[PDB]
């Protein structure tokens, strides 16, 4: 409860993360650091030279092929503990995360781990071990000299002599730095002795891990109020001279409250309070998702657990509940400000994989273990059954958690790409008759103009049955559409729309709901390959509808409008669309040529290219179908130094020379007649 005494003082806060190479001592270090006094945040109170401090250990992923996570995490912290394995030394993955910390103006401190190996396995002398440390330190300081902001290329360098380097063993719970040696008296030659005779418990208290490392933390990693003076200008795109800008610049609880969301686990959003003061029952603007909401329960962290609190000021790490669907990275503020991150594309599942248990035993909580990942991850959809997500790696993570963590031996099919269908020309008028031949509909389908589709995808024109027809009609006419036709707008559905341009059709109003259901069925599965349809306009030109509902069931109306739509589409040059990924790659400049080649080899294109000193951020787009194995390729092409990630970037038309074989595969896979249908197969004779 001394936490509340501490949160009011920015200069007493340490917002930090741990960057460790896969198996260099990360979770071990985190765990034993807390015990020494996936989690979004874990906090620690630490006494240093009389005063107490509150240190926030924020989750900081280091999977270089999930760049998005690494980058976001770095943006949240002011200081990072680089952890390097004494034996193994500075690894390529370690260089990459360090690079990201430096890019996001995060000050580094070093912890050389697994020294216990140096002592027991190799029987090194103190002299030899200190020299080993010096090459590790030299390697790290080459990274800082190369990639740190120019202001800090020398300042941010780490040195054992001032205690911006410590060394020890996370596992065996001990660490040393020279400033700890001179306020305690201990030397390194005893720790060697204590290690070699096996006196683990005396080692543990004569040179304690948490004491030495957190000393380094407090002494050398900045507080929010210190760091936000140089970090906010690099993090935020708005007017710094403004007053929301100055409120974040200085670490300001005076001001209007502004926070960023770091992670989401009811739903719980962890976040960092840049300026102002968060409060329970606080109304806020969610800047990217462009909606509004109210903060229900606020809390602060005590180690792993969240303890309810409500008025907690700038500089702190917060948990809040009931923030709607705001995803990690969103800017939350009492005002409307320029967001820290830009709006991200919507995301839809585009790869699917077939999974089963190869031991027919573990199945029913394999089926729990399936919608269990769907529990925690909305972007994961499960139907065997089928796993559908955002890409190869997104799925693989799940497949990794099922075999190892949930202990299931599993068979896994080759991945399948999810395609879509559209058309490229307008159709002639087509008639659908119900089977009983008492209801008739006359339609055309037209290619939907890009400007209208985009307007639908980005919310300007809402999905669903159209509540305000004359308003939407006017918006459509603002876009390219003929206003009079536009007024017949009825439904918008998954990137398509249905339009009624009939006049004086008695009882049309009795069947309109069924026509829309049938419309939806027609878009659910297109005529080329039963893939979902996008970018089609259906227009109802005319119709004859029976007086009496006994002659108008679903069984009459559905097949009439469904077959009409599909036949018409077949007459309009039906085509396949395929999903693309936006590819965000971070590399040392020397690899620029190689990476470009790699993107071009997968039918991709460079979109953008940003440069900062010796580092390079490139943005590309490539077909999901061409991106399998990309981690492998970009790894060797960069000697493990690429940081990268992907986002959904919508759908584009499949090139004509690739399409027929892809259609054939999809139809074969679905147990259909392999031939791409033609209008002769879908439309009825004479």
Curated annotation (Swiss-Prot):
Binding-site list for GTP: 20-27, 59-63, 113-116
Intracellular or extracellular location(s): Cytoplasm
Domain tr-type G: from-to ranges: 11-225
Cell membrane keyword on record: no
Record-level GO cellular component terms: cytosol; ribonucleoprotein complex
Superkingdom of source: Archaea
Keywords: Cytoplasm, Elongation factor, GTP-binding, Nucleotide-binding, Protein biosynthesis
Residues where Diphthamide is found: 551
Primary site of residence: cytoplasm
PROSITE patterns given in the database record: G_TR_1 (PS00301), G_TR_2 (PS51722)
Molecular function (Gene Ontology), one example: translation elongation factor activity
Pfam families per UniProt: EFG_C (PF00679), EFG_III (PF14492), EFG_IV (PF03764), GTP_EFTU (PF00009), GTP_EFTU_D2 (PF03144)
Functional summary from the UniProt entry: Catalyzes the GTP-dependent ribosomal translocation step during translation elongation. During this step, the ribosome changes from the pre-translocational (PRE) to the post-translocational (POST) state as the newly formed A-site-bound peptidyl-tRNA and P-site-bound deacylated tRNA move to the P and E sites, respectively. Catalyzes the coordinated movement of the two tRNA molecules, the mRNA and conformational changes in the ribosome.
Family affiliation: Belongs to the TRAFAC class translation factor GTPase superfamily. Classic translation factor GTPase family. EF-G/EF-2 subfamily.
Name this protein carries in UniProt: Elongation factor 2
Species of the source: Pyrococcus horikoshii (strain ATCC 700860 / DSM 12428 / JCM 9974 / NBRC 100139 / OT-3)
């Amino acid at each position: 409860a001394k936490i509340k005494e501490l949160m009011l003082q920015p200069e007493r806060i340490r917002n930090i993360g741990i960057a460790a190479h896969i198996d260099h001592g990360k979770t071990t270090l985190s765990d034993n650091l807390l015990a020494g006094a996936n989690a979004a945040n874990v906090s620690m109170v630490h006494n240093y030279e009389g005063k107490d401090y509150l240190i926030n250990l924020i989750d900081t992923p280091g999977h270089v092929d999930f760049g998005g996570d690494v980058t976001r995490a770095m943006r949240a912290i002011d200081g990072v503990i680089i952890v390097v394995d004494a034996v193994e030394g500075v690894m390529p993955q370690t260089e990459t995360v360090v690079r990201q910390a430096l890019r996001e103006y995060v000050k580094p401190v070093l912890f050389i781990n697994k020294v216990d190996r140096l002592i027991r396995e190799l029987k090194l002398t103190p002299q030899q071990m200190m020299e080993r440390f010096s090459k590790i330190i030299m390697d790290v300081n080459r990274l800082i000299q190369r990639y740190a902001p120019e202001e800090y290329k020398k300042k941010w360098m780490v040195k054992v002599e001032d205690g911006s380097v410590a060394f020890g063993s996370a596992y065996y719970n001990w660490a040393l730095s020279v400033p700890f040696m001179k306020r305690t008296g201990v030397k390194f030659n005893e720790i060697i002795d204590l290690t070699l005779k096996g006196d683990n418990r005396t080692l543990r208290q004569k040179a304690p891990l948490h004491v030495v490392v957190l000393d380094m933390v407090v002494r050398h990693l900045p507080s929010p109020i210190e760091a936000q003076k140089y970090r906010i200008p690099h993090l935020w795109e708005g007017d710094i001279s403004s007053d929301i800008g100055q409120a974040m610049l200085n670490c300001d609880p005076k001001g209007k409250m502004v926070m960023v969301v770091t992670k989401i686990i009811g739903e719980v959003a962890t976040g960092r309070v840049w300026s102002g003061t968060v409060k329970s029952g606080q109304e806020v603007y969610l800047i990217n998702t462009k909606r509004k909401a109210r903060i229900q329960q606020v809390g602060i962290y005590m180690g792993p657990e969240r303890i309810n609190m409500e008025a907690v000021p700038a500089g702190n790490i917060v948990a809040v509940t009931g923030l709607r669907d705001a995803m990690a990275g969103e800017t939350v503020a009492e005002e409307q400000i320029e967001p820290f991150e830009a709006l991200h594309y919507v995301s839809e599942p585009v790869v699917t994989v077939a999974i089963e248990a190869k031991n027919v035993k573990d199945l029913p909580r394999l089926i729990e273990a399936l919608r269990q990942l769907a529990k925690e991850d909305p972007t994961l959809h499960v139907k065997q059954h089928l796993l559908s997500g955002m890409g190869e790696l997104h799925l693989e993570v799940k497949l990794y958690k099922l075999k190892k963590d949930w202990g299931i031996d599993i068979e896994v099919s080759e991945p399948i790409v999810v395609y879509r269908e559209s058309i490229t020309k307008s159709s002639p008028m087509v008639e659908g008759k119900s089977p009983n031949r008492h209801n008739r509909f006359y339609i055309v389908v037209e290619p939907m103009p890009d400007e209208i589709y985009n307007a639908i995808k980005e919310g300007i024109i809402p999905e669903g049955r159209v509540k305000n027809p004359k308003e939407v009609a006017k918006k459509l006419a603002e876009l390219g559409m003929d206003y009079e036709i536009a007024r017949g707008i009825v439904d918008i559905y998954n990137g398509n729309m249905f339009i009624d341009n009939t006049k004086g059709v008695q009882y049309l109003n009795e069947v309109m709901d069924l026509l829309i259901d049938g419309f939806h069925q027609a878009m659910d599965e297109g005529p080329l390959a039963r893939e979902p349809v996008m970018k089609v306009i259906v227009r109802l030109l005319d119709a004859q509808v029976h007086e009496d509902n006994v002659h108008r069931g679903p069984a009459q109306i559905y097949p009439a409008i469904r077959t009409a739509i599909h036949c018409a589409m077949m007459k309009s040059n039906p085509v396949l669309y395929e999903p693309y990924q936006k590819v965000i790659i971070n590399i040392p400049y020397e690899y620029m040529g190689a990476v470009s080649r790699e993107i071009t080899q997968r039918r991709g294109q460079l979109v953008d290219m940003k440069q900062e000193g010796e580092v390079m951020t490139i943005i590309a787009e490539a077909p999901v179908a061409e991106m399998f194995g990309f981690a492998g390729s970009i790894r060797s092409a960069t000697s493990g130094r690429a940081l990268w990630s992907t986002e959904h970037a919508g759908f584009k038309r499949v090139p004509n020379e690739l399409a027929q074989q892809i259609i054939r595969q999809i139809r074969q896979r679905k147990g259909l007649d392999p031939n791409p249908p033609t209008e002769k197969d879908v439309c009825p004779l004479f």
